[PDB]
Amino acid sequence: GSDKIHHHHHHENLYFQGYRPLFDKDLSNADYDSSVWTFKNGILTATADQSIWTKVQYENFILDLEFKTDVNTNSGVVIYCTDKGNWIPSSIEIQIADDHHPEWQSYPEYWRCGSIYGHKGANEQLVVKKPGEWNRMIITAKGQQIDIELNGKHIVSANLADWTSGTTNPDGTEIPEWLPIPYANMPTKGYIGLQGKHGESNIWFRNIQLKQL
């Protein structure tokens, strides 16, 4: 049937499951440029390619968020960040992309939405919805064991201990040159961030919540 407005998106409130919002309503517990990120009417959005970061570091957590894309959105969620200034080689990024834009067929699968970017792709392509629709992504980060759920599908399960090379994935495929640290050697505690607008199209987030395990 065609109803949206009378169906619940959760079996129970995440609050009772132990989740708390990652960011305060005024973003007072976040590091960001106020010219880039706004949190208005429940919705978090960026107008440039600068990230928003937690002020405290996290390990052994489940991060549950929603995101909406537009045509060719490019963004992501960053975990285990040990240096916000130099975050690229100092963190692990989970990609967010509008995989439906044909452009994404020009890039490896393990660069697309839901991937542990440059290291391991989704087990099923085009799990992200189309532009304009809310997606739900759940990242379980339990030391070296990383699990990603996207729109109810368990798309990625990875044990970072397998990444003994900084340049070569266990399957022999290339790791981007700019991600040189063997992920087996990466700290499993760090700041959490949302990448900003890395494309010319917008990214929106909402209901970003975290369960401390």
For the chain, what are the domain ranges?
A: 1-213
Which whole-number Å values give the CA distances from 136 to 19, 51, 89, 131, 160, in the listed order?
Answer: 15, 20, 27, 13, 23
Residues 76/135, Cβ–Cβ less than 8 Å = no
Q: DSSP letter at 129?
A: P
CA dist., res. 93 & res. 183, Å (int): 11
Method used to solve the structure: X-ray
Q: Is 161 helix (H, G, I), strand (E, B) or coil?
A: helix
Which whole-number Å values give the CA distances from 193 to 82, 85, 108, 149, 198, in the listed order?
Answer: 11, 12, 24, 18, 14
This PDB structure is determined at a resolution in Å of 1.9
Domain boundaries 1-213, corresponding CATH code: 2.60.120.560
**DSSP-assigned beta bridge partners for residue 212:** 61
